[model samples]
Target: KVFERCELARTLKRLGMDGYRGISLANWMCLAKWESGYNTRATNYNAGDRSTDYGIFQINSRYWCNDGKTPGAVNACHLSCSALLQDNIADAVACAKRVVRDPQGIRAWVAWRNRCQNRDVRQYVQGCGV
Candidate 1:
């Protein structure tokens, strides 16, 4: 529970600090559910039937962690195991802010993408179409 709350604090603070003003608590909560199921130690199955993404943010470990620049990329920062456990949720939130704040990201196209594509709106039956 401590780690979970820490993750939430980092996630919500990242969104706010990075200015994802339009993102709701529900949005963040839903994403948390989908990605890590609120488990900071979660690791995705490699080449699984579901997905290849890994970490708290479920990043493509191949694309995002090629180098130690990312906190989770190396243990020198003591971020690897922790990031493996936490998936650099804070970093993921930063990355997510970039996407959501960009023209091609959350603030880019239709409101539906921002409003409905997540778990809360799965009943809406539509896509972001980016």
Candidate 2:
């Protein structure tokens, strides 16, 4: 599923992403915008690590989810990477919450640092009525 801007905002809020671990909804919005353009089925492969990033938040197979192909990978999220690609984002959101619980916080995603960090991210949720 590719979500519209406001629709995603409201949905994330409902999923408790508004300020989960001190990361605001707009920041989450910015992360998703740049990570997968709000597409639930998005995937990216990292040839260097032989890992894949899955779903809207681009959770990686190397450390978060198990894809059975990433060498010495840890299944911190305790689920198959396929689960991340589902149209229902509940599992994806849950895994995302677990990711931020680590010391890296939202910095777990490089795209968030490159595109969302230190930027005026409010525009992501500007008219979302979130």
Candidate 3:
């Protein structure tokens, strides 16, 4: 499922993503835009680490979800990677919450660091009514 910008913003706000772990909804929007372009089925396989990034948030098999194939993976989110690919983003949102509990917080996603951090992210949710 590919979400429209405001649709995703409103959805994330409803899912408790707004200001989650001190990360704003707009910041989350920016992250999703860069990471997966708001597509729930998006995936990227990392040949270097043999891990796959899954879903809209691009949760990774290396540290977040279990794919049964990534080497030395921790599965900290305690969920199967397949769960992150669902059109319903509830599971992915929950796992993302768990991820930010770490010291790194939202910085756990590199895309957020490089794109959303210290930028004018308000544009992402400007008209979203979120």
Candidate 4:
């Protein structure tokens, strides 16, 4: 668990997002579940269609893991650990943090995600994924 916490912190930092240190682990867990079921090799569902890109993070095959260098990028497990290869994790976290921190960006990002995330949910990070 501590290793996971460390990885979370490190990955978040590498993704260029701050303030996750203060965010609850429960929230992170929930996000992981929603995105990839914590399977590590979960695939992305293009709006719930035939897209079978598997990995824990639900990354698409076309996006980052065309090659096998990134490890688990093609499945649930890969999405859990290797999706960061296409871009740094810090970048995603930074961008996400910006949207979370900014009203304008939050609005747009939420619209793009087409989901209404609870602000309270933003503060709670859960323990999921490897």
Candidate 5:
């Protein structure tokens, strides 16, 4: 399920992402845009290292998820990586919360650093009616 930007904003706000755990809803929206373009089942693989990223947040397989074929994989989210590919994002949101709590903070997403960091992201949720 690909979410429209406004839909995503409302949902994120409802889920308390507006200021949950120090993460701004705007930042979350920006991350969602760059990470998956609001695509729920999006997946990408880096052939150089044979690693994969899955779902809207593009949660990685190296340390955050397990592709089942990636030996020694750590299922940090405590669920199959495929679970992140589904339309239901409950797990994805929970896992994202965990990621944000990590030492890297929102920097866990490179897209955030390059595209969303240090910017006024209020526009991301401007007319969402949240």
Candidate 6:
């Protein structure tokens, strides 16, 4: 399922990501855009490394959610990678919170590091009335 960007922002804010977890809504929105383009079903199978990233946040199977096929996965989020692909994102948000709370913070996401670092993305939420 693909979410309209502004709608996704509003929902993420309601889910306690509007700076409640030390990450601004703008940053959250920006992360979603760069990681998965608001598509809940997104997945990136890194065939070269035999690792996978799942969902809007692109949570990795190497250390977070488990893909089941990936051996030695940390599964730190204690979730199946497919769970992050659901249209209802509550679970994804919950797992992502855990990811951000790690020492890397939002920088754990490669997309955030490459694109959203210190940039202003308030435009993502400006007209959503969120």
TM-score per candidate, chains pooled: 0.47, 0.98, 0.97, 0.36, 0.94, 0.95
Candidate 2 C-alpha error for residue 31, in Å:
0.3
Residue 95 displacement in candidate 4 (angstroms): 11
Residue lDDT tens for model 1, 8-86 = 6454654574235576544554455556666656655454433244454444443333333333332222233334455
TM-score: the better of candidates 2 and 4 = 2
The residue pairs that clash in candidate 6, if any, are none
Write candidate 4's Cα lDDT for 5-95 as tens digits.
4455445444443435344444444454455444454444455433334343344443333434343434322233244333334423433
From the highest TM-score down, the ranking of the candidates is 2, 3, 6, 5, 1, 4
Q: 3-70 in candidate 5: lDDT tens per residue?
A: 99999988878776787778888899999999999999999987867778899899988778778876
List residue ranges in candidate 1 displaced over 4 A.
1-11, 14-21, 46-52, 67-84, 101-130
Tell me which residue pairs clash in candidate 1.
40-85, 56-87, 100-106
Best by lDDT: 2
What are the Cα lDDT values of the candidates? 0.45, 0.94, 0.92, 0.40, 0.86, 0.88
Error of 6 at 109 (Å): 0.6
Task: Evaluate residue 2 in candidate 4 and report its C-alpha lDDT on the 0 to 100 scale.
Answer: 18
Poorest stretch of ten by lDDT in candidate 3: 121-130
Question: What range of 10 consecutive residues in model 1 has the weakest lDDT sum?
Answer: 121-130
lDDT tens string, model 3, 96-116?
999999999989898898988
Spell out the clash pairs found in candidate 5: none
lDDT (C-alpha) at residue 50 in model 1: 30
lDDT of 1 at 17: 40
Using lDDT, rank the candidates from best to worst.
2, 3, 6, 5, 1, 4
What lDDT is reached at residue 74 by model 4? 42
Model 6 root-mean-square deviation: 1.0
Worst 10 residues of 4 by lDDT: 72-81
How far is 111's C-alpha from truth in model 2 (Å)? 0.7
